[PDB]
Amino acid sequence: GSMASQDVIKNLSMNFAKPLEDCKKEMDLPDSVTTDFYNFWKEGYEFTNRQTGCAILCLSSKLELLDQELKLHHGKAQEFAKKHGADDAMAKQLVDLIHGCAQSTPDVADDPCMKTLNVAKCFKAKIHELNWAPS
C-alpha cells in the first residue's frame, strides 16, 4: 500500500540527509538549510533560498550520486534507491520523475544550486501526487 512506498522514500530521505551537518561545516551553509530539510516532506512547504539547493548538491556528492557537471548520475541514483528498499521498477520511476523535473528546469542562470532546488521542488510535488511522501 502507499504506506510501504512512503517507508522506502523515508529510508532514502533519512540516508540522503545523514551528512547534512558535515556539508554545513564544509560549505558554511546557513542553518535555514536544516529547517528546509526538517520540513522537506511537509505538504505546502516552500523552500527558503538557493542554499538549500547547494545542500542537496553536497549531500548528492557525498553519496557519489552527482556527475562532474553537478547533474544527477541517473544510474547511481537508481542503485541508491534499490539499496534502500526500492524495487527496480520503483527506482526507475523515481529517476524518471527527477529526469522529467530536470527537463522542465533548464539551467538558464548557470546556477546549479537554484536549478537543483527547482528540480527538488518539482520532485517533491510529483511524490506528493503519488502519495509517496512520508510524514
Domain limits of the chain? Answer: 2-130
Experimental determination technique: X-ray
Instruction: Note the CATH number of domain 2-130.
Output: 1.10.238.20
The SS3 of residue 85 is coil
Number of neighbouring beta carbons within 10 Å of residue 23? 20
Give 14's contacts (C-beta < 8 A, 6+ positions apart): none
Give 85's contacts (C-beta < 8 A, 6+ positions apart): 7, 8, 11
Q: What share of the chain is helix, strand, coil (3-state, %, to 5)?
A: 65, 0, 35
Pseudo-torsion of CA 82, 83, 85, 91, nearest 10°?
Answer: -20
The SS3 of residue 60 is helix
What resolution, expressed in A, was reported for this entry?
Answer: 1.3
